[PDB]
Structure formats: C-alpha cells, structure tokens
Design a protein around this ligand. Structure first.
Ligand SMILES: CO[C@H]1C[C@H](CC[C@H](C)[C@H](O)[C@H](C)[C@H]2OC(=O)/C=C/C(C)=C/[C@@H](O)[C@H](OC)C[C@@H]3C=CC[C@@H](C[C@H](OC)[C@@]4(CO4)[C@@H](OC)C[C@@H](OC)[C@@H]2C)O3)O[C@@H](C)C1
Ligand SMILES: CO[C@H]1C[C@H](CC[C@H](C)[C@H](O)[C@H](C)[C@H]2OC(=O)/C=C/C(C)=C/[C@@H](O)[C@H](OC)C[C@@H]3C=CC[C@@H](C[C@H](OC)[C@@]4(CO4)[C@@H](OC)C[C@@H](OC)[C@@H]2C)O3)O[C@@H](C)C1
Ligand SMILES: Nc1ncnc2c1ncn2[C@@H]1O[C@H](COP(=O)(O)OP(=O)(O)OP(=O)(O)O)[C@@H](O)[C@H]1O
Ligand SMILES: Nc1ncnc2c1ncn2[C@@H]1O[C@H](COP(=O)(O)OP(=O)(O)OP(=O)(O)O)[C@@H](O)[C@H]1O
Ligand SMILES: [Ca+2]
Ligand SMILES: [Ca+2]
Ligand SMILES: [Ca+2]
Ligand SMILES: [Ca+2]
Ligand SMILES: [Mg+2]
Ligand SMILES: [Mg+2]
Lengths: 353, 357
C-alpha cells in the first residue's frame, strides 16, 4: 500500500492511499530540552520547539528527517523501504528543494518509489477537477493557485504570509482588549480552540458590527480548561475578517478575495471564465462558516459584471490535499508516474521534475 | 453545453437536479393529491385536509402510472423548470424492478415527455459508484423499503438481493408508539411530522443495546430535550435508540424478519464464494434511514459476529448518504465515457423497448 504524506507548516497529515482520511495528523514540530509531534507537545514545558517547515517550505533538513522518520516508524508503523511514498510540496517550491526531498527519501529512507505533488493541485483533484483556482489557507501560509489541466501556473501564483497562526495571535490580541488576558503559549492553545469553535466570516462586516453593538444575539460562552466561562462577541467575526482585511494585523497586502482576483487576471484571458467558475477553498483556515458566501459576494464585486462565479468549499477541506493524494496514488493510470529507486539510481536528481 | 437531468424516484421523496451538481436541486414528497385537477409534492402535502393523497411508488416500485406521470411533469416543469425534450434524463429504479416496469418508464419518457436520450440505473448501484467502487454490497434503507444489493464489477447480482419491508416510515411510526408509553400524545398528521423530526435529530443506534438500556435506566446521561412547535419542551431518553434498534430487531414492530445485519450476511452467502471477501470489505450504507449515528460501528460489530472468524469487514457510511443514489447518478451522467451509453430517441425507435435492458 502506498503512503501519502502531506507535510504542512503546522500539521503533518499522513496515511495510506485508498483511505478516505489521513490516519495520522500531528504538529510539524521538533523539540529539544529530541522529540517529535505529539511527544514534543506533551513535553512542552521543558522543551524548545522548532518548525522545520517555514511558511510551507522545508528549511531545516535535519529536523525534517526527524519528522519523516517519526511519521513512518511511530505514527504509521511502517518500514518506508516497503511502500511507494507520495509527498506534497508548496506552490513555487524551489527545484533544489524538491531534489533534496527526493534524495532523502531514496537515500535515507530507501523508499522503493516516490512522487512529489503540489498541495493545491491535489486539493483541486479531490474536488473532481483538473482546471480551477485554489485558495489554500493553512497554518503559516496562504496561496492562490490557478491550475489549467493539472498544471499550476507559476507566473500567476500568489503567496500571502497570513494564515491560521496569525489569526490565533490576533484573536488573543482582541480578546485581551476585551479585558481577558491571553498571552502565554498555553493561552495561545486555548485561543486556537476558541477560534476553531466559535469564529465565523460575516457576510457584511459593517452590518455585523452594528448587530453585535446593539444586542447580545451574536454572543457565545466558552469554558476555559479551569472552568471559568468567558464571553465572545464581535471577536467571533473580527478574527477571520483579517483574511479579507490584512490591515487588521498591520499588513498592507490585499485580502484573499482581491488576491484571488489578481491571480485570475495574471492568467490567459481565454481560461479566466473556467477559473471563476471553479474556485476551490482548501486548508484549515478556510473552514470558517460563512466564508464561501463572503468569497462569492466579494469576487462578484471585483469580476466583470456578467461573469459566472462558483465557490466550492468541501466539508472535508482541512484534509483535501491529503485526500487528493490518496485518490491520485490509487489510480491505475497513476502507477506509471511513480519514480522508482532503479530509475533514480541511474537518472539521478533530475528525474523528479 | 447541454445539461443532463438526474431524477431519483423514491418511495417517500423525489430527488432531482442536474448532472454535475454535488446535490439534488429539488427534494420533495412523492405524493399526488386530488380534490376530496391535481397537486404534487410540497403543495399536496400543505393542502392535505382538502385533498386525498396517493403514493404512486410503493416500497420502491412504481404502481400507478397516471400519478407517476404527474410527479415527473411537476419535476420537470415546476421544480427544475426545464423542457424535458431538451435534456438527456437519467432515471433510477428499485432493485428487482420488473422488466415491463422499466419498459413503461422508458415509453413514458420518450413518448410523453419527448426526452432526446435517457438511461435507467439501479439505485443501489449508483450509491456504490458514488462511494468510488464498482464491487461491494449496499445496504439501502429509505422511507418505505430496505434492500441489500451485492454488486460485482458494476452489475447487481439479482439472485442475492434481499428486500426488507421495514424502513423510515415504520421507524417514525414506532417512535410515535414508544413516546406514547411516556404519556406523550402524537396522533395527528402534524404531530407525526414532529416525531419524524425528533427521529431525524435525536435518534442513534446503540453499540450494545442491553448495555445502553442499563445506562439509560441508571442515569440521565443519555437524555435529550426537544422543543415542540408550541414552545413546550419534552424529554427523550432510551427512545433515542430503541427506535432504530428496530432495524436490527424487527420483532420490535412484530415482524418475524431477520435484522439488517443478518440480511447483509445472508445476501453475501448467496454470492459466489470467490467474491465474498470483497463484499465484506466493501459494505456501503445508503438512504436516509442509514443516517443514524452509531449505525456503522454496530453493523461492523454484528457482521463480525456472523462472518467467518478471519474475515476482514469494512463499513463505508458517507456523510452525504441520504443523497448518494442521486449523487452517483450525477457523477455517472457527467462522465465522458458514459455519453455513448445514453439510449437516444433514434436507438429506441429502431430497436424497440428491449433496448432499455
Ligand atoms: C499528475 O496528473 C494527473 C492528471 C489526472 C488527475 C486525476 C484526479 C487525481 C481525479 O481522479 C479526477 C479529478 C476525478 O476525480 C476523482 O477521482 C475524484 C473525485 C471527487 C472525490 C469529487 C467530488 O469532490 C465531487 O464533489 C464536489 C463529487 C461531486 C458529486 C456529484 C457530481 C460530481 C461532478 C464532478 O466534477 C466536479 C465529476 C464529473 O463527476 C468528477 O468527480 C467525481 C469526475 C472525476 O472522475 C471519475 C474526476 C475526473 O461532483 O490524472 C492522473 C492520472 C494524472
Ligand atoms: C454503467 O456502467 C459504468 C461502470 C463505471 C462507473 C463508474 C463510476 C460512475 C465512477 O466514476 C467510479 C466508481 C470512480 O468514482 C468516482 O467517479 C467518484 C468517486 C468518489 C466520489 C468517491 C468518494 O466517495 C471517496 O469517498 C469514500 C473518496 C475517497 C477519498 C480518498 C481515496 C478514495 C478511494 C477510491 O476508491 C474507494 C478511488 C480509487 O480513488 C476512487 O474514487 C475516488 C476512484 C474512482 O475513479 C477516479 C472511481 C473508479 O476514497 O463506468 C461508467 C463509465 C459505466
Ligand atoms: N474549524 C476551523 N476553523 C478555523 N480554523 C481552523 C479550523 N480547523 C483548523 N483550523 C486552522 O487551520 C490551520 C491548520 O490547517 P492546515 O492543516 O491546512 O495547515 P498546514 O498545512 O499545517 O499549514 P500550511 O499549508 O500553511 O503549511 C490551523 O491554524 C488551525 O487552527
Ligand atoms: N438524519 C436522519 N436520521 C434518521 N432518518 C432519516 C434522516 N434523514 C432522513 N431520514 C429518513 O429517511 C427516509 C427518507 O430516505 P430516502 O430519501 O432515502 O427514502 P426514499 O428513497 O424516499 O424511499 P425508498 O428508498 O424506500 O423508496 C425518511 O423516512 C426520513 O425520515
Ligand atoms: Ca493526532
Ligand atoms: Ca495568565
Ligand atoms: Ca425540499
Ligand atoms: Ca447509445
Ligand atoms: Mg498545507
Ligand atoms: Mg430510495
């Protein structure tokens, strides 16, 4: 059985091709007083943590190996030399980076075969399409990736360094401004939970602010680990509003609607209608209730007055990259695409592109 | 680019829409009402008290062609707002639907509705496709009927199909009955709709029924509150799981029949020894009456107890399974390799009714 390993900036998602979900989901962290993932989390108080995947790109290769070794031996309990292994990489991952990933897989782990797929392309596949534009928003990075018949269009790809971890930090900030105190790393973990549980994207931000200001209809309660119950009001929607107004955290970037539009505008005029009609959301930071409807409204306002816009937001989009890899690796038509160890031994580094 | 239509004709509900969509656009009651000319679906339902209601699709099989025509007409003109002469139309049928029945469906589509092309698929087969498989065994439990349909390389195996005349309508009826034991009163048609809502929202399948009963008797941890349309709040305890337990124990409603785990096993045993392993590893749940939380794990456990001690058992229960028949039809009718398989008006004219098979 082939393995699928989706290396995220915050979370590793890993499992077996043919399964409908990753068997293992754990943090992409390595800790020293070494420990990986959950074992590093459970010893948080005495460890210093490193994140080898920085904004989607692998930057610390020694620690990345530790993550991969942990994935195979501790999480999946497999010998890597026995399984073809599909790995994922960020949009615009440098060629040398991909080559190094490949070298480690073949030379350190001795995999019999491998393949490296672009994350957003796999999410597109998981939605049953080969043409469209993906918004992939994760923990450390957000990308817009337009794709034509399987090919990610590199000149049109946009990277935004605003994602899940920034939204968490911003919710800590504004909850504290309300009169709580969320500051410490343990308090960050609590706020991350509040974010995932109680936040949403308002269809109209100014209206939603007025509603919250006049009544308590939008309020929710939340029980802290120690039992103290607290109240979340307009923070519920001001937090993910940041995606649409990066100025909220002092960033000058256009918001996710405008970056989607700008990305489409960099593509060949003749494919743009297909992109607008096939906008797919993916990644954990696209999970906010209300996001698909807000994106529909926002892109309609930017796009030619006639254009047909469609947002696709799968329920399982926090795992759609992984799912796409699971589908792909299961196709009989894909089996000729694996890069084998024999092939790499002869052809060398070059073969992976 | 011409859109194809997908119409999934259920015992209780029509599911209808456009091939390529991820969900049916229209979902409405399979009812035709006439003054005590005719009303269909939601309007027939909302006008009950002045109409006589008919249900033309008994236990999955179309029994009244005049009324079924009215349903299809309403589906095209009122729900989907399409001229049927302009769209290839995929229709669905029950397991073991008689050949003359499929031929009648086809004759109506071509001669009354003037569809340019059409296809008829077995409902359970479409749900299998929707789960990404062409071999497996489907448990399809709807409003009026439940079937086990084993399928090998895309074809249902008729000799091994099991039909159980127990489904969603009976569970609703049984929940009303057991709620009455508590002193509640659910008698009217409006009251039955409230019980249907309670069932759909609060019911679940116990992993171990006798243990669940003990838990419910010794603690209030399984109880849920439900607000009635008139503001009154009632309490639901062990009725949450006694209701769908009926699926595993049809004696709860006085049926001598085997439960759904046993029919699944019996169905598999009617198939070639050489395919059984594949069937056990690909048991797909479909239909609204398979939606109860806990059903997959209980089925896994019961089938494990019945099957040879080595056997590898896997239950697939898609989140969207109340629509998976429709969804499979949407996918199939969207495929480039399916386009040849449409029966066109010309092929029908040249070959006669037999071509639909
Ligand atoms: C390296 O480079 C490649 C290039 C290429 C990649 C192939 C890729 C991995 C995938 O294999 C495909 C994309 C495949 O898609 C799949 O295999 C899987 C698809 C899934 C779960 C789709 C759902 O997300 C979808 O829900 C929203 C279901 C939903 C429900 C009802 C209607 C449908 C409508 C859908 O078009 C929206 C489709 C028409 O049915 C559609 O998908 C069911 C059909 C489907 O071929 C059966 C796709 C054609 O939509 O090949 C590789 C070999 C090498
Ligand atoms: C009239 O006679 C026919 C006979 C035949 C019908 C074909 C049918 C309509 C379908 O087109 C296919 C069954 C097709 O399946 C599909 O088109 C659609 C599939 C979907 C939404 C699957 C999900 O439900 C699934 O979730 C649980 C996703 C999930 C996620 C991860 C991994 C996968 C694992 C899956 O094997 C479980 C597969 C390996 O990926 C699988 O399906 C993604 C691949 C898939 O080909 C891309 C199927 C091969 O599992 O042809 C017609 C032309 C004529
Ligand atoms: N239901 C939810 N609502 C809001 N945010 C969520 C939800 N679920 C997860 N997230 C956020 O999604 C992020 C993780 O998503 P994902 O697994 O797609 O990221 P990654 O792949 O690790 O990061 P990247 O793609 O940036 O490298 C976390 O910031 C998490 O808090
Ligand atoms: N979430 C749920 N939990 C339990 N039961 C449900 C749920 N949702 C729907 N049902 C029941 O499912 C039944 C309808 O399912 P479905 O649409 O598959 O049936 P159908 O195709 O009309 O009938 P049949 O297949 O018997 O001809 C109704 O009895 C309904 O109450
Ligand atoms: Ca985990
Ligand atoms: Ca503190
Ligand atoms: Ca409806
Ligand atoms: Ca034909
Ligand atoms: Mg990611
Ligand atoms: Mg049905």
């Amino acid at each position: 059985t082939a393995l699928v390993c989706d290396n995220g900036s915050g979370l590793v998602k890993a499992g077996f091709a043919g399964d409908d979900a990753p068997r293992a989901v754990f943090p992409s962290i390595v800790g020293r007083p070494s420990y990986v993932g959950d074992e590093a989390q459970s010893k948080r108080g005495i460890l210093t943590l490193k994140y080898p995947i920085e904004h989607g790109i692998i930057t610390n290769w020694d620690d990345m190996e530790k993550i991969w070794h942990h994935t195979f031996y501790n999480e999946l309990r497999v010998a890597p030399e026995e399984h073809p292994t599909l790995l994922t990489e960020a949009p615009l991952n440098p060629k040398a980076n991909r080559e190094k990933m490949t070298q480690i897989m073949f030379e350190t782990f001795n995999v019999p075969a491998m393949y490296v797929a672009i994350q957003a392309v796999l999410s597109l596949y998981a939605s049953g399409r080969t043409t469209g534009i993906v918004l992939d928003s994760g923990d450390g990075v957000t990308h817009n990736v337009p794709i034509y018949e399987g090919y990610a269009l590199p000149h049109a790809i946009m990277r935004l360094d605003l994602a899940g971890r920034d939204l968490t930090d911003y919710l800590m900030k504004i909850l504290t401004e309300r009169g709580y105190s969320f500051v410490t790393t343990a308090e960050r973990e609590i706020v991350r939970d509040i974010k995932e549980k109680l936040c949403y994207v308002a269809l109209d931000f100014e209206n939603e602010m007025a509603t919250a200001a006049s009544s308590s209809s939008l309020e929710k309660s939340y029980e802290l680990p120690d039992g103290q119950v607290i109240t979340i009001g307009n923070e519920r929607f001001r937090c993910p509003e940041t995606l649409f107004q990066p100025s909220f955290i002092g960033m000058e970037s256009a918001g996710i609607h405008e970056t989607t539009y700008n990305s489409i505008m960099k593509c060949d005029i003749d494919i743009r209608k297909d992109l607008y009609a096939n906008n797919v959301m993916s990644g954990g930071t696209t999970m906010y209730p209300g996001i698909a409807d807000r994106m529909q409204k926002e892109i309609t306002a930017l796009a030619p007055s006639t254009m047909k816009i469609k947002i696709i937001a799968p329920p399982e989009r926090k795992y759609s990259v992984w799912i796409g890899g699971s589908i792909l690796a299961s196709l009989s038509t894909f089996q000729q695409m694996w890069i084998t160890k024999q092939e790499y031994d002869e052809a060398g580094p070059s073969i992976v592109h």
